Design a protein around this ligand. Structure first.
Ligand SMILES: O=C(O)CNC(=O)c1ncc(-c2cccc(Cl)c2)cc1O
Ligand SMILES: [Fe+2]
Length: 216
């Protein structure tokens, strides 16, 4: 599917109506598996952090850590298919521009690659951008082959429009997810009992980002 068709016929109407959009089979099995291989190699060669401190504990031997991260620009050797994914995300957003709300998107973060180690940790309920830091759209790509949430957990639960009625999104292989980054979409990751990977980029709105500059 050409990016403009996906954008105009699906992403733009889904985002403006619901603030959330799920695209399955985004890149196809071959590219999806190559991204998986690159992320696993990052993991196996120690490129991730040790994980978010979950419980601090007076005996630090008992510390519990959760999601581990690494920031990826997309041009590093061994990361060029992650770079292909990132360019594919940009292609979609570029073909949306002027139609995602009244936002004018003019940049994005590097990719945050996340690894949940499977030790029963998740991610607490939160809003990505609660305080106007410039980020207007969250984009997540999942790469977990044959993920079964009834067995392994790890559901992303989003509370669309902030209301208590929630949407449960499995972190399925080759699934792409967009949602508004602000308080319209509080969300959380339920405990994961197997290794769970995801790649996130955030897109900036020009006006909000130009003002966040003075909030820094
Ligand atoms: O994995 C998923 O399906 C959902 N993940 C998130 O919702 C998330 N959100 C925010 C952050 C995050 C929040 C603050 C700082 C940084 Cl570097 C990352 C990490 C995160 O993993
Ligand atoms: Fe988040």
């Amino acid at each position: 599917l050409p990016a403009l068709k996906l954008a105009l016929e699906y992403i733009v109407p889904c985002m403006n109506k619901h603030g959330i959009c799920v695209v399955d089979d985004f890149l196809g099995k071959e590219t999806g598996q190559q991204i998986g291989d690159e992320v696993r190699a990052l993991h196996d060669t120690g490129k991730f952090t040790d994980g978010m401190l979950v419980a601090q504990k007076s005996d630090s031997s008992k510390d519990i850590r959760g999601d581990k991260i690494t920031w990826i620009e997309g041009k590093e050797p061994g990361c060029e298919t992650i770079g292909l994914l990132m360019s594919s995300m940009d292609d979609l957003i570029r073909h949306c521009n002027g139609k995602l709300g009244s936002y004018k998107i003019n940049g994005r973060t590097k990719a945050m690659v996340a690894c949940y180690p499977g030790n029963g940790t998740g991610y607490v309920r939160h809003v990505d951008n609660p305080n106007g830091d410039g980020r207007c759209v969250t984009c997540i790509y999942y790469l977990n082959k044959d993920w079964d949430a009834k067995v392994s957990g790890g559901i992303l639960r989003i509370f669309p429009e902030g209301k208590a009625q929630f949407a449960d999104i499995e972190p399925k292989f080759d699934r792409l997810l967009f949602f508004w980054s602000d308080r319209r979409n509080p969300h959380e990751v339920q405990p994961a009992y197997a290794t769970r990977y995801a790649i996130t980029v955030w897109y900036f709105d020009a006006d909000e980002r130009a003002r966040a500059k003075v909030k820094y």
